[PDB]
Symmetry: C5
Subunit: 230 residues, 5 copies
């Protein structure tokens, strides 16, 4: 059971229920957008669904840990969700371009998918101590650099500028990725490589950031689906 | 297991099952209202769904507490649901205006959403002892004042008076918010700041009030959706 | 685990699974009746759903009780389901009249809903020892008298006689209510006020009676929905 | 946890997951057959759903029993599923005749339903030691004789011969009932009355036979629904 | 709870959540492909669903095992999923040929289904020590040889070459079966009959290979369904 002074556990509870709510929202609304937009909504629901399932597990772990007198929820177990949800979120950049009928190579899809996995496998390997934390940071920054380029100066960026319906959503989502998602590499540096931030602080931040970095991402996509389904 | 003479636990059981029933009702009926009304029904189902999930957790907590000989379910854990359900319920004021094709700025939507979060974060901070209870009450009353103004003298109020289909539902819902929802600030004053009411009494009241403050809210919205889907 | 020779526990298992089956049936078939009939099917599914959820809880309680050497499942916990399912079942009398396009005041709906809650709150208060068992019986008989009058000599009765499609279903359902449902006041008298029947006998009877008093009620409604959806 | 060399427990695991798979299949495909065939598919899904729920329970029981050093899963708990699933399966003989638009009295439906319950109540009473095992066998054989006659020489048999679309499915299903289902009375004789077969052997056989006696039954019905939905 | 440095347990967590995601994806998207393709999508969802349910069980087992100080998850319990999922995956070769309206005997369907079960029953019998591991390998290789022939030189192969829409998917899927699925017989030889590979290594490999051997299989099928649903 969650104790009352435990803000980390409160944050796990909040985000766990938010994510169940988000899942149902995307799935149920996805049934009522134009067919072109249905896949978008599906991906959003999947993202929130994986997160929900994992947060249900992770919250249990935390609470146990707090009863056993040493509260910890290691960042490394986050990757069980990130390995799935982060590639899904990134392919949404391709998917919504397709939905507005932008012309865009499938090469953009693979660039997005590989860059995302390079980024995550680098960090996971570093956190799981399979390789040096420095080497994991570098490999992960390479992945980052690829995805950032795709959506800020690469094909997907250019496709989005050509289309006008998606242009503004694309701009919102790419900002979340640029700025919203910067907490993760920051946690890896200051949390993990430097030890300047405790895991409990990190867990609160990561938990609260999921309102932006996943739910608001999905709601921006729903907003354009619904304006385009008109 | 729920013990004999435990009305608090009985109230948790009643409301927990009511809320599952409500969720399914809104989702299943939402499939059969006009498309304009589908989002309304979705929000209602989400509200009852979050509440159901949380009441399942909270009832477990209570029962444990009663076996351990000190029965308590602190109000603070209510905010895990309120932080999500209360903003959802309030945005229904915007959503149903849109469904009847009222003209209404999105500024009304943000005013509703911010005022609601100011209201709740103020109370949560006060209850979680992050700030003085007095300061949390004041900040929360500011949030309240904003939402009350929106639906009683602000844009949403005026839009609703212009439309005739939603006028009467809008009036019902705004009364629930004005009167039905007054139990919450009252519990904060008499329960928490004054200690004149025990948490067990509060928990019964809050549990029973969810029939009005959430379910009847949703059923009023369904009633207008169905009269307008004709 | 359910032990050998435990017919009470067997009855809980039977009814718990029947009710899950019934729920899915009503929801899945409700998707394929004429729109006029969809709400009926919804209410039936809700009734069986609440019952299923509660029987899952109650069966657990019983089994525990049998391991702890004193087998009891008090009737009072039945009211957690009855408070919801009984009003739902009774409003079906109004709903199916509306579905056949009978003319029927909403006053009939409120009479049904109030009479049902008077009936149950009276009994609950009596069991639960909030008031005398005698007084709870009387108050509950008042509720009964109201609902019986509505469907045997009141508006709903007359509406049903005017319509021919629903006439025969209405007659079946009102007989279940008159006769099928008489076990409940009987249990209160002989079980609770007189002590002439043990709770274990009562629990078997109540469990088995749910085949008639809820499932067959729902199947009669489905049968007319399907003959009218043609 | 399922232990090494436990084939009985392996069989429970296999069948439990098969039955979940079957349920989802029938429900999801039932959404895509002609409306005439939707009820068939519903009944099949219900059958597999009850079985799945019960096998989840029963497998837990077995595993417990094996840890407590005496492995037993008594046949008597099978009746909790059979009492529901066997009547459902048998009414499929009526339902698919209706789906092909055969002319068939509802008397055939009641004959099927009563004969099935006579058959099962007889066996249950015998196994639960409420009556002699001999008497339970006799009463159950009476039930059997009724259903066998209905589908091999009674109205349903004749209706099916008149129709050509269902003729061959009807023949397949009646053979499963004649032959596939003979394991059950055989287990009652050799298992229970004679003691010549242990419950563990019986449980393996019954578990494996559900591939034929329930799933293949449902798949034959789906096969004709889909050839008729063309 | 999943412990630190447990890559086997991490792999179980990853795959368990991936498979839930995959299930929902196939079911939800299957609602939006042409009717010809709906069964394909159904089979894919079933495959991932069984796997998910089993991985939820298996991960629990592993974690227990690691607390009890001897980490093992025997390959034999894999067959509880394989016995169902592998026949399903293989019949997809028939199903998608039907969906593109290829001419193909049902004999191909039975050849696929029998060859698959021969293959698995042989291995299961060998692993469960019911027969020699050698004999189980041989019997299983016979099953393999049948299915490989069907899709590389048999009817299904030839049908697929005649059609052009499915040709390329058929080629992708048959390569996964040829190459992707070779890990399983390899594990049986080197893992089980030779002991050259520990179960923990095997479990990681098998867990990770499900991204290819089940999910990517399903996504290739979805990709052709969606290009053909256009
Ligand atoms: C279309 C509409 C559908 C209607 C669906 C309504 C669902 C029913 C609502 C209640 C269900 C939730 O009920 C219960 O909630 C608690 C906490 O919230 C969950 O949580 C508990 O167990 C899980 C799983 O081990 C842990 O991760 C968690 O830490 C613990 O608190 C339970 O796993 C869930 O069973
Ligand atoms: C379209 C609708 C179709 C729906 C199909 C029908 C669904 C039927 C499901 C009923 C079974 C409910 O099953 C069980 O219910 C009990 C109470 O009843 C729940 O409750 C129990 O465990 C949860 C676990 O966190 C606790 O929160 C709770 O305090 C405790 O009493 C269980 O979590 C649930 O597993
Ligand atoms: C309609 C679309 C298809 C949907 C497919 C659904 C398949 C579900 C398969 C069965 C699920 C498991 O069903 C399982 O059954 C047993 C009893 O029957 C329950 O039983 C257990 O928990 C409940 C509630 O916590 C207790 O009341 C009970 O004493 C205990 O044994 C499990 O809680 C439930 O999890
Ligand atoms: C079809 C549309 C999409 C559906 C959603 C996606 C699939 C959902 C995956 C759920 C995974 C099941 O997760 C878990 O499985 C194990 C066995 O596998 C179940 O089994 C465990 O508990 C039950 C209930 O007491 C026992 O009967 C059983 O003996 C035990 O092993 C758990 O009760 C279930 O929670
Ligand atoms: C499709 C639209 C609607 C979808 C709605 C989605 C709601 C579901 C959200 C999360 C539900 C909770 O999901 C939760 O996940 C954790 C971690 O993976 C599981 O955790 C537990 O599961 C089973 C229990 O037998 C074990 O195998 C496992 O080891 C254990 O940790 C919980 O059983 C489940 O309760
Ligand atoms: C829903 C969860 C999200 C959006 C997670 C995002 C995670 C990242 C963007 C991770 C990035 C990393 C780098 C850029 C380098 C260092 C390693 C990582 C994995 C932390
Ligand atoms: C479903 C739950 C509901 C409707 C909860 C509503 C809660 C409020 C309206 C809370 C209001 C508060 C104030 C007005 C000031 C004091 C602090 C609060 C949060 C108790
Ligand atoms: C599904 C459960 C059902 C149909 C329950 C019905 C219950 C009643 C009709 C209860 C009736 C009572 C009276 C008529 C007076 C005495 C008190 C009651 C509540 C037992
Ligand atoms: C899915 C389960 C099935 C098909 C169960 C079938 C059970 C029977 C056909 C039982 C038959 C019996 C008799 C014919 C007489 C003896 C008693 C029974 C109940 C074992
Ligand atoms: C999703 C799981 C999959 C695809 C499992 C596949 C398993 C096989 C292809 C097993 C093959 C075997 C042989 C070819 C011979 C030896 C025995 C087996 C069962 C390991
Ligand atoms: C920052 C957003 C986080 C949301 C919290 C999780 C709750 C579940 C999300 C469901 C939200 C549906 C909201 C619908 C918005 C409708 C009006 C939009 C008009 C601009
Ligand atoms: C040619 C067929 C195209 C198939 C679909 C595209 C390939 C798969 C895309 C998967 C994206 C989600 C991956 C998340 C999990 C990654 C592994 C951990
Ligand atoms: C995304 C919003 C982040 C707010 C983080 C609040 C700071 C948490 C650290 C508190 C110390 C424990
Ligand atoms: C407590 C569970 C809520 C279930 C939904 C109640 C459905 C009521 C339908 C009202 C019928 C028309 C009234 C005018
Ligand atoms: C540009 C697209 C905008 C859509 C924005 C939708 C914001 C909706 C917020 C839903 C209601 C609040 C949900 C709870 C917030 C929880 C904070 C903790
Ligand atoms: C909202 C309903 C209020 C009911 C109050 C019950 C009395 C609680 C004090 C024990
Ligand atoms: C009389 C008791 C009924 C209890 C049934 C318990 C099992 C769950 C309900 C399944 C629903 C079965 C639907 C059968 C429809 C029969 C069609 C025949 C028309 C006369
Ligand atoms: C526990 C006591 C409350 C019972 C709730 C469930 C059974 C009664 C459901 C009544 C639903 C109708 C309420 C009125 C809605 C009519 C629409 C508003 C005008
Ligand atoms: C919803 C109904 C909950 C049960 C209310 C019980 C009323 C008790 C009245 C006691 C009087 C003293
Ligand atoms: C609905 C009919 C149920 C009859 C059950 C009889 C119970 C007898 C008491 C057993 C002790
Ligand atoms: C899937 C379980 C199959 C069990 C077969 C066991 C037969 C041998 C028993 C010794
Ligand atoms: C005798 C074996 C009967 C089959 C049992 C299968 C059990 C586990 C899976 C249940 C789901 C089956 C879905 C089958 C789809 C078959 C499509 C056939 C195409 C002609
Ligand atoms: C264990 C008690 C008996 C359970 C029966 C299980 C399902 C049998 C089929 C029920 C359908 C019979 C009632 C249909 C009535 C149609 C309306 C008149
Ligand atoms: C719903 C099925 C319940 C089965 C009960 C069977 C009871 C048989 C009668 C026992 C006679 C004892 C003398
Ligand atoms: C329907 C398929 C029948 C296969 C039966 C397998 C025989 C089981 C023999 C008992 C094994 C020993 C159990 C103790
Ligand atoms: C290599 C296998 C990759 C899939 C791994 C599974 C990850 C979880 C389930 C993901 C399912 C969703 C994939 C959607 C892909 C949409 C492809 C866009 C067009 C090419
Ligand atoms: C004559 C109509 C037959 C149509 C159904 C096809 C036969 C069954 C196909 C089953 C495929 C799933 C196989 C899983 C078997 C599980 C064994 C354990
Ligand atoms: C000695 C004889 C060995 C028999 C092996 C049987 C293996 C059966 C596995 C379960 C099959 C489920 C369809």
């Amino acid at each position: 059971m969650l104790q009352a002074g435990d803000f980390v556990g409160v944050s796990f509870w909040l985000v766990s229920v938010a994510m169940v709510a988000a899942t149902v929202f995307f799935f149920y609304e996805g049934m009522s957008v134009k067919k072109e937009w249905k896949l978008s909504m599906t991906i959003a629901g999947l993202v929130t669904l994986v997160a929900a399932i994992h947060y249900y597990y992770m919250r249990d772990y935390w609470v146990a840990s707090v009863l056993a007198g040493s509260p910890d929820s290691p960042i490394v177990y986050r990757y069980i969700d990130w390995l799935i949800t982060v590639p899904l979120l990134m392919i949404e950049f391709f998917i919504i371009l397709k939905a507005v009928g932008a012309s865009i190579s499938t090469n953009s899809f693979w660039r997005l998918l590989v860059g995302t996995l390079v980024m995550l496998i680098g960090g996971f390997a570093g956190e799981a101590m399979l390789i040096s934390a420095s080497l994991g940071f570098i490999i992960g920054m390479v992945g980052w650099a690829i995805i950032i380029w795709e959506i800020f100066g690469g094909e997907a960026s250019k496709a989005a500028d050509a289309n006008a319906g998606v242009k503004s959503a694309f701009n919102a989502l790419r900002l979340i990725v640029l700025v919203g998602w910067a907490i993760y590499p920051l946690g890896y540096i200051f949390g993990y490589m430097m030890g300047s931030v405790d895991s409990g602080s990190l867990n609160i931040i990561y938990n609260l950031a999921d309102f932006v970095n996943k739910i608001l991402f999905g709601l921006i996509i729903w907003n354009v689906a619904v304006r385009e389904s008109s």
